[PDB]
Amino acid sequence: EVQLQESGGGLVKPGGSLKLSCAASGFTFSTYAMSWVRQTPEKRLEWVASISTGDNTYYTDSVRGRFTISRDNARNILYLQMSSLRSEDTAMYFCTRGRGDRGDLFGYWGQGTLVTVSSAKTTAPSVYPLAPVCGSSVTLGCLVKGYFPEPVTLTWNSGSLSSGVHTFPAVLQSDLYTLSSSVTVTSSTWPSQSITCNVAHPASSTKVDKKIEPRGPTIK
Amino acid sequence: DIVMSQSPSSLAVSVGEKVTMSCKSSQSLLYRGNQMNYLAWYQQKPGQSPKLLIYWASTRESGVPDRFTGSGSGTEFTLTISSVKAEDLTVYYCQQYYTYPRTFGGGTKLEIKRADAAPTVSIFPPSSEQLTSGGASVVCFLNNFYPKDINVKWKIDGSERQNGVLNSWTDQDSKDSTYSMSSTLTLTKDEYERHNSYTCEATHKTSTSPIVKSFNR
């Protein structure tokens, strides 16, 4: 029935511009007030703007004079023109339709389009093997430091090693992402069997393998 | 602003339990003209948009199961689930539409109770490979613990360091309902080599004393 689909999201530099579009179908579009609501990386929900059935517009202060909400009833689409983009504007942007023919209560939401505002350069991660230091099981690891943008793909032994794995959500520090992963196995499994960290970063077009070498005295 | 506050922010639950979520309003949402509360609840499952659950504080949206029940008035609102189902284990947001700006509460996340488990702690020196580039990250994994509340301190030669620590926390594990955490201390290579003892210490309610993992450079 009711379908909403956002588009036009992407990566931009601070001070940049974007125009989101929201394609609606499965209802009489002119009847309803529409809105844009964003979800920040901290997963807070922030109402951004609303447009009435008669083109009256409402904004939250932070985007006033920078964003413009509009509708095109002939084409069933809602727009959000974004200008002078800021770091804070980074969010998933949802378009919504009023529940009833009355107000802007967020009755129906699209699946969202992602907007990222960052001054970071595209950066391949540095991938470091984490070998155990001075039993029954042993925990190995992989550090994927300082990359942009998201995402990376990390597997262990090309996907063969899947259980006992924790891969921690990427986190931002100094405009770059860092991620890590642990893999826990039987002590008899390793280092008898080889274990390798595979990291792909499809944006710097890099693919890296890192074998976890056991620590020990083939020291000089 | 009109400020919406949800309590608590997270709640440990058992399937089949009755649970209750609070949403508080910094100003009343009760409109005298029609005695309606301009308050809505949303559910947001992982990867999905929020979906409207309740509106006018107590009106279920169509196709919303009877176990969901909203109540309250003025500034104090409640979302109740009669018998929680596994698919209800997620985030719920309240929202006022009494005035502009439209404002949301910070959300309440429901999670699964499971019985306390101690972290398995592992410390890792910087890789020789990172050292070559003049960097030195020290990594500490704290894996498979419950409840999720945990504290990590880095101590270097017996003294505590806070700058340059990067922490990350998993979501509750779907298989064992436990939590894991990663802590990374990044130093300059030079500063890493001015010290010997590196220590990751985890404070968790499963022990009256820290779980300590250390190495000497």
Author numbering:
A (entry chain H): 1 to 134, 139 to 224
B (entry chain L): 1 to 217
Sentences reproduced from the published study:
In this study, we have characterised two monoclonal antibodies against CCR5 which recognise a short linear epitope in the N-terminal region of the receptor. One antibody to this domain, RoAb13 combines potent HIV blocking activity with the ability to block chemokine induced monocyte migration.
The crystals diffracting to 2.1 Å were obtained in the vapour diffusion experiments with 20% (w/v) PEG2K MME, 0.01M Nickel Chloride and 0.1M Tris pH 7.5 after 7 days. A comparison of the RoAb13 heavy and light chain amino acid sequence with the closest germ line sequences shows that the antibody (especially the heavy chain) has been modified by somatic cell hypermutation in several places, indicative of antigen-driven selection. The presence of an extended area of positive charge in the vicinity of non-template amino acids is suggestive of a possible site of tyrosine sulphate binding, but targeted mutagenesis of the antibody will be required to confirm this hypothesis.
